[PDB]
Each structure stands twice: as C-alpha cells, then as structure tokens.
Amino acid sequence: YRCKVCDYIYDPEVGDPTSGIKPGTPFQELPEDWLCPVCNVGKDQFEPLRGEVRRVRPEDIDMFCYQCSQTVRGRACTVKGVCGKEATVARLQDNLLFAIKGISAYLYHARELGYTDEVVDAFLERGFYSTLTNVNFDAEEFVSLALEAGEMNLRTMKLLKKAHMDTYGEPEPAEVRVGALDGPAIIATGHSLKALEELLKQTEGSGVNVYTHSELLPAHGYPGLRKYPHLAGQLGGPWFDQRETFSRYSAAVLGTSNCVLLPRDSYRDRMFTCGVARLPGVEHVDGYDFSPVIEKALELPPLKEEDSATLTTGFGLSTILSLADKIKELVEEGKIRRFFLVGGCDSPLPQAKYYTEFVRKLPEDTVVLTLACGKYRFNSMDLGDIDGIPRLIDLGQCNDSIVAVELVEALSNLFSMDVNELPLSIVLSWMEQKAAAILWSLLSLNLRGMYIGPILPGWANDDIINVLVDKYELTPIGDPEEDIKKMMEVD
Amino acid sequence: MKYRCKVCDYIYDPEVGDPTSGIKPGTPFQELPEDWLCPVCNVGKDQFEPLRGEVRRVRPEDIDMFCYQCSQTVRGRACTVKGVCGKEATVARLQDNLLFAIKGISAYLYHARELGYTDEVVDAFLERGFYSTLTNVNFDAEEFVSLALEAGEMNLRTMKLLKKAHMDTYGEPEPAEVRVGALDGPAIIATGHSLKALEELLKQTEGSGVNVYTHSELLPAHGYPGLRKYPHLAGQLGGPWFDQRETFSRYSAAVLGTSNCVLLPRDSYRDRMFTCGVARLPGVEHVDGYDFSPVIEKALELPPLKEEDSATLTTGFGLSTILSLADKIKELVEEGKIRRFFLVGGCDSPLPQAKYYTEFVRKLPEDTVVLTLACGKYRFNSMDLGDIDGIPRLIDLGQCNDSIVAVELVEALSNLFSMDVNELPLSIVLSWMEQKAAAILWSLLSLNLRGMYIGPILPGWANDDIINVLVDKYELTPIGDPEEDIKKMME
Ligand code: SF4
Ligand code: SF4
Ligand SMILES: [Fe+3]
Ligand SMILES: [Fe+3]
C-alpha cells in the first residue's frame, strides 16, 4: 500500500520492527488505531499500489495546498490532503476563491464611488470560510457555491454599472483618437474610472493631455468623463503592449488597477501606481493626490502630434435599445444572420490569435459585441455596418459584461424566444480572476454552448472539465473556420 | 553555454537552436533576436539564466512556489518556479499568506454576522486584500508585509467586535466547572465555534429532556451566563477536535457540527451526524438555517446515553474576573511569589511534534501561571496544577477568537505593574493549525510582541526569506525542547 497523502509505501515485506510489526505482517493485520508515520492519517488513507503517483515533470501535480500545519513534511499537500480533502475538492475551493477575488475587485471599485452591497460581503465571508481547512468537503456544494458566486457577481456588476451611471451618466458612442497630440502627457492604465476622474479634475487648466490605455478606453463614452477637453484620446492598446507603449511615448504613466507589469528602465522613473496597484521601485500615489504625476508630465519632454486613427467605443444599453426595431426588421428579413459575443480578458498567448482570425472570417451578415481588453484583437478592423447597424459594438470594460447580459434579455423579449433559442453565439476570452467570476456568472444564467479561450483554466482537473462540458456544454475554442461553421448551421 | 528559463525550465541548447521559431541549429544565445521568447511559456530572453548549477534533486513537495490562477500559467497547469506574469516565489507566498489571514478574518466575520454584528471597514479591507492578490496588481513584497500587518490589525478589530457580540448576546463569561462525562438520556454533541447555533439548539431543546454536550471548541460556552442558564447543557464530552473519530463512535449520540474542524465520518456515526452553518460533509444531512428538529428527532430515536464517572474542567475567565484580582497579582509579583506568566495555547493538530506542549506545561515551575485558549488547551487542561495564593495556575480564556482578551490582558498587566509591554514577566508560546491562527499571529505581530514561540511547525508557505523576516525583525522563535525553552524564557 502507498499512502494517498504522502506516498509512503507500507510494504508487508519489511514491516516495522520498532513498533511491534515483525517483518511479514500483512497490511490488514495492523492495529485499528494505527496512523501514518509521516502524515498521521489512519489505515483508510492507504491505497493498494497505484503507481508513480507524484514524480511530476512536464505537469501533473495532483493538487496543491499548504495552508495548515498538518501538511505533509511542512511543505505542501500534493496528492491528497492530510485533512482528508481530495484533489478535485481543493481545485474547486481554489475556483471559488478566484471567483470571489473577481467579485472583490468589482466591489472595491464600486465602494470607491460610495456604492456598497451587504449581502455580497456576507457571501464573501461565507465562501472564504467554506474554503478553510476542515469545514467543507462536499464537491457538489462547491458547484452550488460557484453558481451562487456567479449570481453574486451578477449583482456586483449591476451595482458597479449603477455606480458608474450615477457618477458619470450612461455611456454613449464615441470616436476616440488613438494617437498623440502636442504637449505633456499622462497615460492612464487599468479599470478605475474614479482615479481617472480625479486626475482629469486635477488637470483642468494644467494643459497636460491625458490619454487612456487598455481598459480605460470605455471612459470616452461616459458623459461625465468625455466632457474634459484635456482627455485627448486613446494611446496604446491592450495591457500587454504596455512595455513598448510606455517606452515610445515620452509621458508620465499611471496605473490605476490590475494589469500593470514590472517596468523597464526607460520609463521606471516616470511611472506611478495608485489604488491597489503597486510595483517595486515605482512611486505610489497617496490616495488621489496626483501632484507627482502632473509634476513629472510637466518635467518631461512633451509629446509630438502624430497622424492619428480612431476607435469606436461606449455602446450603453440605451443606444443599443434605440436600434431594436431595425435589428428586428433586419433579422426577420435575413440581412443579419447571427449575433456573436466575442471578447473578455486577453493574454499575449499565441492561441489568442484565434480571436483575430475568428472575427476576420466571420460572415458579413453578422454583428460582434466585444468587451474588456480582448477587444484590441479586432476593434481597429473596418467592419462597417449592416443597413445602419454597426457590425462591431463595444460595451466597455470586463465589468460591462452585465450590460451584455441585459442585452440578451432584451433580445429574448425582442424576438419572443427563450434565451437559449436566440441567433446568438458566445465566445469568451479569459485571463484572470475577474474573468472567472464572469464565467461563473454566465454559467449561473444557464448559458449553454459557450466557447472559451485561450486555454482551459489551470485549476480544472478532468473531473471539473467534464462536469462543465457535459452539464453546461462549455466548448473549448478549436479552429476559427470550423467553429463558425458549427455555430451557424441549422441545416 | 546552455540557458535555462527561470519560469518553465525550458533549456535553450545552442547545438539545436530553435527550429520552431526560425533559429537555425548552431546559434549562440546572445546572437538571438531581442524579441525571441521561450517556445513553451512565451517569456522573453530577459528571464533566461545560463544553465549554471544543472544539479536537480528531490522535486516532490520541494516546489519553489505554486500558482495557476491565470491563463498565462506555464503549460496551462501551474507556475512552479517563477510566474509567466513576472511574480516571484516570495511574492506568491506572501500573497497566499495574506489570503490565509483574511480567511481567518472572514471566519470570525461570519460568526459575528450570525449575531447581527458587522463592520464595514473590515469588509472594505477584505476586498482590498483580495484585489491586492489578483494577477497583475501588486509585485511589491514589502507592501505585502505591510498588508499582513494591516490584516493583523483588522483581525484584532474583528475579534473585538465578535467579543462585543458574544457579550451582548450572552453576557460576560465567568469561571465554570464543567463535567466531562456523559449523563443518562438522549444526547446531542455539538462541535465547532458557533455559539449562536448552540443557543438556538438549547432554546429548541428546552423541555425535550435531551442533554446537550459541548465538544472541542464549544466548551467556553459554559462560562457565558446566557448559555449556562439552560439546564440541559449537561457538560463537556470528548476533548479536542481530532479525537472526533473515536468520540462520536463511543457515545450513542446525535452529532452536530457548527463550524470548522469536522472530519470525514466513519460509518458508525454517519447516519447520526448533521452539519449547519458553513460546515458541510458529503453524505451528511445539513441543517437549513438552524431549526434543529431533525437532530432532536434523531437524538430521541437513538438508545439513550449512560452515566459515567466524570472528570471536571474549569473554563471561562472573562476580563472582569481577572481584573478583580489585579492587586493580588501585584502583591504576588512584587513580593516575588509569582515570577513569570506564560501564554501557552492556540489551535492544535494531531501532529506528534505537538506532544511538546504537554511536556512544556508538565515541566513548568510552580511559581508560574499559564493562560490557554483554543484547542491547544486540551493538551494540559486536565492536569491538576492547583494554585499559588488563590490565583489558579491554569486560566482558560475561551475560544481561539478569545485571543483578543489575552491581548487586553497583557495591556492590563503593563498598566498593572507600570512596565513597558516588552519588559513584562510574560512569555508567549503559540500553537497554530489553520488560517484563523495565521490571522491571530499577524495580530500579535502588529502588536510588536517579540520573542514569541510557535509550534508545531513553521508555516508551509514561509520560504527562507519570509522566515528570515519573521526571525530577524520580530524574533519569532520556533519551539525546541521544553526544558531548554523554559530555561531561556525564564531568564
Ligand atoms: S487543509 Fe488539508 S490539504 Fe490543505 S494543507 Fe491542511 S491538510 Fe493539507
Ligand atoms: S498570475 Fe503569474 S504565477 Fe499566477 S498563474 Fe498567472 S502567470 Fe502563473
Ligand atoms: Fe503518508
Ligand atoms: Fe519558458
């Protein structure tokens, strides 16, 4: 028998002479209250010879957990928990943890605006308590808890969108100049619209121009944010062009939320962090006091005007609903054949080129709704429109997933069909915990047949992957052409 | 030279080159393009060191770090040496540390909320911390040290709020002599920390005539005037949490788990155990929001318990009972008839290295008093230690969350003898097992208590750098040998 927890082999050939086990005693001729000499688990946590359990190299660590003192050798539980928890349950606990992390991020951003939800904080406590050492061992309960986390994330994104709309108005379409103007510059990266508003308020009259980057692009749609003239436009693209963007523009850089990367020496003395963002050797902004960043921007050599391009962002729900009747006409005529939700968080992985290919081969009688940084794979494509309806529609940040939700609910009422009968396909890009919370949000809405890229989450063992694919029909991204062919044929 | 990826250990060999990217066989590493990245995890030339120290030894459980929360993760399985995102092992371990501290805080928050007691600033800090440990938000280790200390302070605040909840709902605890041993009649044994579930159970059992016994962590309930007022609160039964498997087997009782430390059941008592609150076990009935009718029904269906020659324990020393003896303690210390106080307690484990505690207390000189708490008390609370001059040599402050009164106690002592906190005749010996204990430890560290002892082991997430921080900046001393430790602590 080899120990499930620490892979200690009890071999009936040796026995244990020091304890009374003369050499030759079978495993089942051991005392009843005998425990493991390494991990202190009973006779049950001994399995008849499995085979080279750990010995992991290219992958296959069965599980990981070192949160309690019982952990094997004081380093990590990696096959089975000393507490008795198996690998699948540990991975489900980590899944719930990531979802609640995404919820907590959106919660922090809402509270930045004075918007609070008590039941969500209670659920945070409840979930983190559920992932303690010896509290919960039920996997199905963790499925239930993941779905409840999806529901709470719906609620949290709803609260954050209400915070944004009350503080800045409902976003409406805006053509954003991507390209520099003449003058000192501050580039802002992240999600915090409150930090951007404070900076814009502090820079009115200073004459330094403020540009958005990555997930701060949707700010150009908010009436309370676009009203500032020194909000010049976009500059750079998604988060991972950061190191080149911040290098090439001679500007002060401020990172407001996550997706900030370790800086390169070219712009290290001209970068700042604020909110929760924090980098070693980078100056951090005390609350919202952006005096150092403005100082830097005015000390730096100004930017140079450049032939600019444009991006179109900020489709609030109301702008889309003012087009519902034409969309109805167009689908019933047949001049629009399907809606595709293609977006979410991105990564510099090669498999994410899939997205640029996917939209590039999409038929021209289709429309795309995009989201988060994964929009920067195809938002510059000149796709045009269908009888006045744009083929690309930018709802905003990842937290604007919620309006996407609202949209389908309208569409189900528009065409008088159940949600899982619409001419709608869903293609997710995920990268972080916020995306995990969004994914479980979509799963709590029973959205079947969704596609996911660039990879399946690293915390999902075979058990979890199969539960998703057989109970929720979550389809991994494969080949763009074949995927489109599968999604569009009711024939 | 050959070159090793720090992130995924892909070896670039100048004899082969890299056929997949364009590097013909024979190219030296420094004659590679600037934009050449690892063909496995796509991290640049920057994170490549010359294959120095090709030595590799035991890899199981000797994983430098672990993290698989994002899609960038190595091989889509786990980052185990350095993050593709750029996060180092020390920072990952500090993030996990903060996560465990906030997990303990969340547990105490849930228990406080059970009583209608909530604190907004603590939930704000929870959100803030989880956001600090998202993917690309914080890479500054010093800031995570600061956040661990802030988590200690927030945990102090949470424990204070929880103690106020307990005292408002049940009164201030006072010493109680509780019978450990069964009575005649049907029985329900309750395990965990939730006093509200116990109160609801006792109210629902008034008149039913079934006797309720406390186990592991519900023992301090016998000190609360609002809980000891119920006659059917018979006494203690069993000991700490880890005797569960035998205790629940030997007594023909219905089992109810109110909080954490519930273990996978054995078939003898599975059909007679119930969970409630956050505790949940597979194949065990869960109680839906109190309403303990199923548990009472079960207790009434089982063969009743039989009386047994019992022992006794003394628990529940509230702050007021202790402070009403402060002048006697002053007399005794100033005369010299008490030479040092020892705080010995905290959550315990079925680890063998924890036998130290029973030895440590058993060898303590008779001119010392011990203050204990949590499950680590069950190592020496049955010892007949007696008293010194009317002051008991063992004092049970209550649950692990009653650590806070210990905090208050020491400040009283510093004001009692008019001496600085870090000059009192007081030594601290911690037992830890879980995340609640981690929060308590960071609470103690935010209070600058130097020279504390910790057992049974050093946290499994503390790499050499973190351990170095603890031992050089806060003089955290691991427990060694009882006599040697006592002689050092008594000098
Ligand atoms: S909680 Fe369980 S799996 Fe995690 S370290 Fe402790 S014994 Fe191991
Ligand atoms: S955040 Fe970094 S360490 Fe964690 S999974 Fe992503 S790449 Fe790996
Ligand atoms: Fe073992
Ligand atoms: Fe690599």
XYZ file of N, CA, C and O in Angstrom, chain B residues 135-256:
488
model
N -4.039 39.035 -10.365
C -2.935 38.605 -11.221
C -1.877 39.692 -11.366
O -0.724 39.510 -10.956
N -2.240 40.829 -11.945
C -1.221 41.830 -12.220
C -1.513 43.147 -11.523
O -1.687 44.180 -12.182
N -1.528 43.121 -10.188
C -1.846 44.278 -9.360
C -0.658 44.682 -8.500
O -0.240 45.841 -8.501
N -0.101 43.731 -7.751
C 0.936 44.011 -6.766
C 2.078 43.024 -6.953
O 1.854 41.809 -6.993
N 3.293 43.549 -7.098
C 4.503 42.735 -7.126
C 5.496 43.181 -6.063
O 6.654 42.743 -6.084
N 5.076 44.056 -5.153
C 5.945 44.621 -4.132
C 5.809 43.800 -2.858
O 4.739 43.778 -2.242
N 6.898 43.143 -2.457
C 6.856 42.264 -1.290
C 6.711 43.050 0.008
O 5.975 42.634 0.911
N 7.428 44.165 0.133
C 7.329 44.984 1.335
C 5.894 45.428 1.577
O 5.435 45.483 2.725
N 5.175 45.761 0.501
C 3.778 46.147 0.638
C 2.922 44.983 1.123
O 1.965 45.192 1.873
N 3.259 43.752 0.733
C 2.518 42.602 1.242
C 2.858 42.319 2.701
O 2.011 41.815 3.446
N 4.073 42.650 3.138
C 4.365 42.601 4.569
C 3.493 43.610 5.311
O 2.889 43.304 6.350
N 3.440 44.840 4.788
C 2.573 45.869 5.353
C 1.122 45.405 5.410
O 0.416 45.660 6.391
N 0.657 44.724 4.361
C -0.729 44.267 4.331
C -0.959 43.110 5.285
O -2.061 42.968 5.817
N 0.046 42.263 5.505
C -0.096 41.240 6.530
C -0.249 41.879 7.904
O -1.108 41.472 8.697
N 0.531 42.927 8.181
C 0.377 43.614 9.463
C -0.977 44.319 9.561
O -1.628 44.295 10.618
N -1.422 44.945 8.468
C -2.740 45.571 8.457
C -3.838 44.535 8.652
O -4.848 44.805 9.312
N -3.651 43.341 8.089
C -4.598 42.258 8.304
C -4.609 41.836 9.762
O -5.669 41.525 10.313
N -3.442 41.828 10.406
C -3.415 41.575 11.838
C -4.230 42.592 12.615
O -5.000 42.238 13.515
N -4.089 43.870 12.260
C -4.848 44.915 12.944
C -6.352 44.760 12.702
O -7.167 44.868 13.634
N -6.740 44.513 11.447
C -8.147 44.295 11.130
C -8.693 43.062 11.839
O -9.867 43.032 12.220
N -7.855 42.044 12.038
C -8.285 40.852 12.757
C -8.479 41.144 14.236
O -9.389 40.599 14.867
N -7.604 41.974 14.809
C -7.810 42.492 16.158
C -9.174 43.166 16.274
O -9.953 42.895 17.198
N -9.469 44.058 15.325
C -10.752 44.759 15.327
C -11.912 43.778 15.204
O -12.931 43.914 15.896
N -11.763 42.767 14.347
C -12.823 41.788 14.140
C -13.055 40.956 15.394
O -14.203 40.702 15.771
N -11.979 40.531 16.058
C -12.117 39.766 17.290
C -12.764 40.600 18.381
O -13.576 40.090 19.159
N -12.435 41.893 18.446
C -13.088 42.762 19.421
C -14.582 42.873 19.140
O -15.406 42.774 20.059
N -14.951 43.078 17.870
C -16.368 43.175 17.525
C -17.084 41.867 17.842
O -18.216 41.869 18.346
N -16.425 40.739 17.578
C -17.018 39.441 17.870
C -17.198 39.246 19.370
O -18.223 38.718 19.816
N -16.221 39.679 20.169
C -16.359 39.572 21.616
C -17.497 40.455 22.121
O -18.238 40.066 23.033
N -17.646 41.651 21.548
C -18.769 42.503 21.925
C -20.092 41.841 21.577
O -21.053 41.909 22.350
N -20.159 41.198 20.410
C -21.358 40.452 20.038
C -21.668 39.370 21.066
O -22.797 39.266 21.564
N -20.662 38.560 21.403
C -20.863 37.470 22.355
C -21.318 37.994 23.712
O -22.222 37.427 24.333
N -20.699 39.074 24.187
C -21.037 39.614 25.498
C -22.411 40.269 25.501
O -23.111 40.232 26.520
N -22.822 40.870 24.381
C -24.151 41.467 24.341
C -25.237 40.406 24.241
O -26.334 40.593 24.778
N -24.945 39.283 23.585
C -25.952 38.246 23.387
C -26.016 37.250 24.536
O -27.072 36.650 24.763
N -24.925 37.060 25.274
C -24.872 36.010 26.279
C -24.300 36.459 27.618
O -24.267 35.652 28.554
N -23.844 37.702 27.740
C -23.227 38.167 28.963
C -21.730 37.914 28.995
O -21.155 37.239 28.138
N -21.086 38.467 30.020
C -19.651 38.252 30.166
C -19.394 36.883 30.781
O -19.975 36.559 31.822
N -18.541 36.059 30.177
C -18.259 34.741 30.757
C -17.583 34.850 32.118
O -16.847 35.797 32.402
N -17.866 33.870 32.970
C -17.260 33.739 34.287
C -16.866 32.288 34.503
O -17.422 31.392 33.856
N -15.869 32.036 35.355
C -15.372 30.667 35.541
C -16.497 29.676 35.806
O -17.463 29.973 36.510
N -16.354 28.486 35.232
C -17.350 27.435 35.348
C -16.650 26.091 35.432
O -15.685 25.833 34.701
N -17.141 25.254 36.347
C -16.690 23.876 36.497
C -17.626 22.991 35.681
O -18.773 22.759 36.074
N -17.135 22.498 34.550
C -17.924 21.737 33.590
C -17.554 20.264 33.707
O -16.367 19.909 33.721
N -18.576 19.415 33.803
C -18.400 17.971 33.857
C -18.069 17.411 32.480
O -18.817 17.614 31.517
N -16.932 16.731 32.388
C -16.564 15.962 31.209
C -16.947 14.518 31.502
O -16.337 13.862 32.353
N -17.958 14.032 30.808
C -18.546 12.732 31.072
C -20.037 12.771 30.795
O -20.699 13.800 30.893
N -20.582 11.609 30.448
C -21.953 11.526 29.975
C -22.937 11.426 31.136
O -22.600 11.002 32.245
N -24.171 11.833 30.862
C -25.306 11.595 31.739
C -26.241 10.581 31.094
O -26.080 10.200 29.933
N -27.229 10.144 31.867
C -28.272 9.288 31.326
C -29.238 10.124 30.497
O -29.618 11.230 30.891
N -29.631 9.590 29.342
C -30.589 10.253 28.490
C -30.077 10.486 27.082
O -28.877 10.389 26.806
N -30.994 10.788 26.158
C -30.591 11.106 24.781
C -29.613 12.271 24.732
O -29.622 13.157 25.589
N -28.769 12.274 23.700
C -27.657 13.211 23.653
C -27.461 13.811 22.269
O -27.608 13.129 21.250
N -27.104 15.093 22.255
C -26.588 15.780 21.079
C -25.239 16.377 21.456
O -25.141 17.141 22.424
N -24.201 16.009 20.711
C -22.873 16.591 20.859
C -22.681 17.624 19.759
O -22.864 17.319 18.575
N -22.293 18.832 20.145
C -22.075 19.928 19.213
C -20.590 20.266 19.151
O -19.942 20.431 20.191
N -20.060 20.370 17.931
C -18.665 20.712 17.689
C -18.575 22.019 16.911
O -19.445 22.332 16.091
N -17.510 22.778 17.173
C -17.213 23.978 16.414
C -17.118 25.228 17.267
O -16.900 25.143 18.476
N -17.330 26.394 16.656
C -17.194 27.672 17.341
C -18.504 28.427 17.473
O -18.626 29.268 18.370
N -19.479 28.149 16.610
C -20.705 28.929 16.553
C -21.510 28.822 17.842
O -22.156 27.799 18.099
N -21.468 29.874 18.664
C -22.314 29.910 19.847
C -23.770 30.201 19.513
O -24.652 29.847 20.303
N -24.051 30.835 18.373
C -25.442 31.113 18.032
C -26.200 29.833 17.701
O -27.357 29.667 18.107
N -25.576 28.928 16.942
C -26.200 27.638 16.671
C -26.459 26.881 17.963
O -27.518 26.267 18.129
N -25.505 26.927 18.896
C -25.693 26.264 20.183
C -26.837 26.891 20.967
O -27.628 26.181 21.595
N -26.941 28.222 20.943
C -28.029 28.891 21.647
C -29.379 28.501 21.064
O -30.331 28.229 21.805
N -29.479 28.478 19.735
C -30.726 28.072 19.097
C -31.062 26.627 19.431
O -32.231 26.287 19.651
N -30.049 25.758 19.456
C -30.267 24.363 19.818
C -30.768 24.239 21.253
O -31.701 23.480 21.534
N -30.148 24.975 22.179
C -30.566 24.917 23.577
C -31.977 25.457 23.765
O -32.739 24.931 24.583
N -32.341 26.515 23.035
C -33.714 27.009 23.109
C -34.702 25.993 22.546
O -35.784 25.791 23.111
N -34.350 25.341 21.440
C -35.239 24.351 20.849
C -35.318 23.068 21.666
O -36.215 22.256 21.419
N -34.410 22.860 22.619
C -34.380 21.638 23.414
C -34.881 21.840 24.839
O -34.794 20.914 25.650
N -35.405 23.019 25.164
C -35.940 23.268 26.499
C -37.251 22.513 26.670
O -38.246 22.824 26.009
N -37.256 21.522 27.564
C -38.399 20.677 27.810
C -38.324 19.321 27.137
O -38.946 18.366 27.617
N -37.575 19.215 26.038
C -37.408 17.929 25.371
C -36.689 16.915 26.250
O -36.824 15.707 26.024
N -35.922 17.376 27.237
C -35.242 16.490 28.154
C -33.996 15.832 27.611
O -33.370 15.044 28.332
N -33.610 16.123 26.371
C -32.360 15.610 25.828
C -31.220 16.520 26.259
O -31.351 17.752 26.271
N -30.098 15.916 26.638
C -28.961 16.666 27.153
C -27.990 17.001 26.031
O -27.708 16.171 25.161
N -27.489 18.232 26.057
C -26.575 18.745 25.045
C -25.191 18.852 25.668
O -25.037 19.407 26.763
N -24.193 18.305 24.978
C -22.815 18.340 25.435
C -21.964 19.117 24.439
O -22.203 19.074 23.228
N -20.974 19.834 24.958
C -20.048 20.573 24.115
C -18.824 19.721 23.800
O -18.452 18.826 24.565
N -18.198 20.005 22.658
C -17.027 19.268 22.205
C -16.034 20.213 21.549
O -16.427 21.130 20.822
N -14.747 19.984 21.824
C -13.649 20.713 21.193
C -13.684 22.197 21.535
O -12.991 22.640 22.458
N -14.385 22.986 20.725
C -14.366 24.436 20.852
C -15.627 25.068 21.441
O -15.638 26.285 21.665
N -16.690 24.308 21.680
C -17.879 24.858 22.321
C -17.817 24.788 23.841
O -18.770 25.199 24.509
N -16.711 24.301 24.391
C -16.531 24.285 25.840
C -16.660 25.660 26.489
O -17.401 25.776 27.484
N -16.032 26.732 25.983
C -16.151 28.034 26.663
C -17.582 28.497 26.841
O -17.834 29.375 27.676
N -18.526 27.925 26.092
C -19.924 28.306 26.237
C -20.414 28.121 27.667
O -21.336 28.820 28.101
N -19.801 27.209 28.423
C -20.260 27.003 29.790
C -19.996 28.204 30.691
O -20.550 28.258 31.793
N -19.182 29.163 30.255
C -18.923 30.348 31.048
C -19.926 31.458 30.808
O -20.124 32.323 31.667
N -20.563 31.445 29.644
C -21.499 32.503 29.275
C -22.795 32.377 30.068
O -23.464 31.337 29.984
N -23.191 33.403 30.832
C -24.415 33.296 31.646
C -25.662 32.980 30.842
O -26.566 32.306 31.356
N -25.744 33.451 29.597
C -26.892 33.177 28.755
C -26.937 31.782 28.179
O -27.964 31.384 27.622
N -25.840 31.037 28.280
C -25.774 29.663 27.801
C -25.787 28.647 28.929
O -26.428 27.599 28.804
N -25.102 28.938 30.037
C -25.140 28.064 31.202
C -26.483 28.108 31.919
O -26.735 27.262 32.783
N -27.338 29.079 31.588
C -28.660 29.179 32.194
C -29.585 28.044 31.770
O -30.618 27.831 32.413
N -29.252 27.332 30.696
C -30.068 26.221 30.229
C -29.671 24.950 30.966
O -28.508 24.533 30.875
N -30.583 24.315 31.706
C -30.205 23.102 32.453
C -29.714 21.963 31.580
O -28.751 21.280 31.946
N -30.347 21.738 30.435
C -30.000 20.655 29.517
C -28.637 20.846 28.833
O -28.281 20.067 27.930
N -27.867 21.857 29.231
C -26.467 21.976 28.838
C -25.671 21.173 29.858
O -25.196 21.702 30.865
N -25.522 19.874 29.592
C -25.017 18.955 30.609
C -23.549 19.216 30.924
O -23.190 19.501 32.073
N -22.684 19.133 29.917
C -21.273 19.388 30.139
C -20.455 19.101 28.893
O -20.984 19.051 27.783
N -19.151 18.937 29.098
C -18.246 18.589 28.015
C -18.286 17.078 27.778
O -18.713 16.302 28.638
N -17.854 16.669 26.586
C -17.828 15.253 26.224
C -16.868 15.083 25.059
O -17.042 15.723 24.016
N -15.866 14.221 25.228
C -14.737 14.198 24.322
C -13.789 15.339 24.637
O -13.946 16.067 25.619
N -12.784 15.493 23.787
C -11.782 16.507 24.004
C -11.656 17.437 22.816
O -12.637 18.040 22.369
N -10.437 17.585 22.287
C -10.235 18.471 21.133
C -10.888 17.919 19.878
O -11.564 16.889 19.922
N -10.674 18.582 18.745
C -11.381 18.188 17.533
C -10.917 16.833 17.012
O -11.737 16.026 16.561
N -9.624 16.538 17.119
C -9.078 15.371 16.436
C -9.345 14.044 17.142
O -9.021 12.994 16.579
N -9.939 14.043 18.333
C -10.452 12.788 18.865
C -11.838 12.450 18.327
O -12.362 11.376 18.645
N -12.424 13.348 17.527
C -13.734 13.201 16.900
C -14.031 11.757 16.511
O -15.000 11.159 16.998
N -13.165 11.191 15.662
C -13.416 9.889 15.052
C -13.722 8.821 16.095
O -14.545 7.929 15.862
N -13.074 8.899 17.255
C -13.367 7.956 18.326
C -14.523 8.423 19.199
O -15.411 7.624 19.520
N -14.541 9.710 19.558
C -15.564 10.220 20.466
C -16.959 9.933 19.931
O -17.766 9.256 20.580
N -17.247 10.425 18.727
C -18.554 10.214 18.117
C -18.873 8.734 17.941
O -20.050 8.369 17.863
N -17.852 7.875 17.884
C -18.103 6.442 17.789
C -18.551 5.874 19.128
O -19.434 5.010 19.178
N -17.945 6.336 20.224
C -18.147 5.679 21.511
C -19.456 6.087 22.180
O -20.076 5.266 22.868
N -19.916 7.313 21.965
C -21.164 7.788 22.546
C -22.302 7.695 21.539
O -22.179 8.170 20.406
N -23.402 7.068 21.959
C -24.574 6.853 21.110
C -25.418 8.130 21.076
O -26.506 8.224 21.647
N -24.884 9.137 20.388
C -25.469 10.468 20.385
C -25.623 10.982 18.960
O -24.971 10.507 18.027
N -26.510 11.963 18.805
C -26.598 12.719 17.563
C -25.519 13.794 17.548
O -25.324 14.501 18.540
N -24.823 13.927 16.423
C -23.702 14.849 16.298
C -24.119 16.023 15.421
O -24.766 15.839 14.384
N -23.753 17.231 15.846
C -23.997 18.449 15.084
C -22.708 19.255 15.009
O -22.154 19.634 16.050
